[PDB]
Swiss-Prot record, chain D:
High-level lineage: Eukaryota, Metazoa, Chordata, Craniata, Vertebrata
UniProt site positions, description: Interacts with diacetylated histone H3: S54
Full protein name: YEATS domain-containing protein 4
Subcellular location per the Swiss-Prot or TrEMBL entry: Nucleus
Keyword annotations of the record: Chromatin regulator, Coiled coil, Growth regulation, Isopeptide bond, Nucleus, Transcription, Transcription regulation, Ubl conjugation
Function: Chromatin reader component of the NuA4 histone acetyltransferase (HAT) complex, a complex involved in transcriptional activation of select genes principally by acetylation of nucleosomal histones H4 and H2A. Specifically recognizes and binds acylated histone H3, with a preference for histone H3 diacetylated at 'Lys-18' and 'Lys-27' (H3K18ac and H3K27ac) or histone H3 diacetylated at 'Lys-14' and 'Lys-27' (H3K14ac and H3K27ac). Also able to recognize and bind crotonylated histone H3.
Residues covered by the YEATS domain: 1-125
Superkingdom of the organism of origin: Eukaryota
Organism: Homo sapiens
Residues of the full protein shown: 20 to 144 of 227
Result of altering Y55A: Impaired binding to histone H3 diacetylated at 'Lys-14' and 'Lys-27' (H3K14ac and H3K27ac), and subsequent deposition of histone H2AZ1/H2A.Z into specific chromatin regions
MF GO annotations: histone binding; histone H3K18ac reader activity; histone H3K27ac reader activity; structural constituent of cytoskeleton
Amino acid sequence: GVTIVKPIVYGNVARYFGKKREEDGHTHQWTVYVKPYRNEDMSAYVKKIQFKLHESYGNPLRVVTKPPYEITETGWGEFEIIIKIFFIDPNERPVTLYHLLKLFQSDTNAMLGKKTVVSEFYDEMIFQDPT
Amino acid sequence: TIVKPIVYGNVARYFGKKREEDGHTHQWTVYVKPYRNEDMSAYVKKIQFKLHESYGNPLRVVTKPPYEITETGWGEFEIIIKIFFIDPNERPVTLYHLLKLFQSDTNAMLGKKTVVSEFYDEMIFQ
Amino acid sequence: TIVKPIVYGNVARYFGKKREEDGHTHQWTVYVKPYRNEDMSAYVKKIQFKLHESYGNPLRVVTKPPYEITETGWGEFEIIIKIFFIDPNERPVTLYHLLKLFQSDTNAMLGKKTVVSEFYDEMIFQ
Amino acid sequence: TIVKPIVYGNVARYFGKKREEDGHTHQWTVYVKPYRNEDMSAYVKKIQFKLHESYGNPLRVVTKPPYEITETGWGEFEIIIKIFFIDPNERPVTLYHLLKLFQSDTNAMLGKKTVVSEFYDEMIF
Ligand SMILES: O=C(Nc1ccc(C(=O)N2CC(c3nccs3)C2)s1)[C@@H]1CCCN1
Ligand SMILES: O=C(Nc1ccc(C(=O)N2CC(c3nccs3)C2)s1)[C@@H]1CCCN1
Ligand SMILES: O=C(Nc1ccc(C(=O)N2CC(c3nccs3)C2)s1)[C@@H]1CCCN1
Ligand SMILES: O=C(Nc1ccc(C(=O)N2CC(c3nccs3)C2)s1)[C@@H]1CCCN1
């Protein structure tokens, strides 16, 4: 048996509209995502990835079966999103991730003039494959 | 069986007004890049960007990264992207992209100074 | 006992003119962040930022990320950073940072608009 | 077997003009980092960064974290990264990195302040 490491990145990006939107009061557009770090086809071993949004969103249990594993929405506030990665192999248990959706730019990055809020974290999906 | 994810599309920026010399209103850059950072020149020989016949030398080509073509113009048209590979037995990949210049009704004043129209795809090998 | 690498420091920006009300000339933000991004709040209870005694409320506390404190002033002084951990059986980690406001004769003479001064360190706890 | 994932590469930033003293245009930082927020100095003795032979002391050696080398210049060139281990019976790992300085037209129009070229690898024990 060999140890197999699949490095991934996950989190969300966000952009401020500049003001409140008149129709719904939304202020940001954001995209929560899960990506492989390397330029590889993650669908070779991932069956699906579900993003559990806040209950106020329509169909809050989002399911992405085809890459890219990204969900783009709008809103005005920050809430926790549960990410669960399901694998094709039935012996490989799913990975559950927790991400606080970040909309508001930190003071440090605002002074640095960064144009996009980026809240990205890392994970090492570890597998044990027979040789 | 090796799958290489890519994204393709264009970015564009409005001049603010029409340019008097040629009537152009936007500068745009059509591009192809990997979904995640990698040396795509290890397996891509060159990428052709077939512009509208109005442009001089409409069949542009880029032989090394970054695979991008920057131009100006006044309207939206279809660009044909043809990706050639170092492996002489790998058939080229042809993509079609509609150049986006004008912001939609959504991102009209939503702080987007540069419009983006980008799409995910996958190149499959052997 | 685990070692968690961190980066601490500050960014600063000149107003462009001395503020007449209080003579302040710069806005700055002192911060602590992990070397590689991670949820520091999983093991950090709070971080205290002790400013110069002349400030109003010189002792600031941050309990949730981003662990940053923004203020204004006219000079460079030493800030004491105390990092408290969740496990109550843990002495805090004390960092010392000299706030940097003024652009050097070469480190930012290329026309830069923001000053940055940060350093690497490690937290040995638990 | 123990697997230690790492990332390596460089970040670059344009000066805004060309420095008249030496013709340099960019500042860059070549580095090696752990993938997660760990302490590599528990098993890493030193990391060598072999710059182009024109630089002064081109064989830069970093014996304590962070494993970064910041310099300036005007062109892109290959850097050889060699990672030495505390265990004397572990063979060093050699990495090759092409320094990236120049920003693409796409990222320039997007207003990105920084050029990044970073890659993933693993050290197996
Ligand atoms: O903000 C917070 N929770 C949020 C949950 C949903 C938010 C949002 O922005 N939404 C756009 C939207 C609509 N879809 C259709 C009509 S409305 C739902 S915010 C908290 C509480 C303490 C601090 N953070
Ligand atoms: O816009 C559209 N077709 C366009 C084709 C070329 C366009 C452009 O921007 N051009 C600058 C220019 C030159 N470059 C060098 C000499 S001329 C040509 S536009 C359509 C049809 C109706 C709405 N969409
Ligand atoms: O400058 C220096 N120490 C500084 C201490 C406090 C500074 C500051 O900027 N502020 C306090 C504050 C106030 N606003 C109203 C009343 S107090 C804004 S500076 C040194 C000593 C030698 C050279 N560097
Ligand atoms: O550019 C290239 N190779 C380079 C090697 C070192 C470079 C550099 O920028 N610097 C050395 C240094 C000095 N300043 C004064 C004395 S030494 C600053 S460039 C080529 C040709 C096309 C791509 N590869």
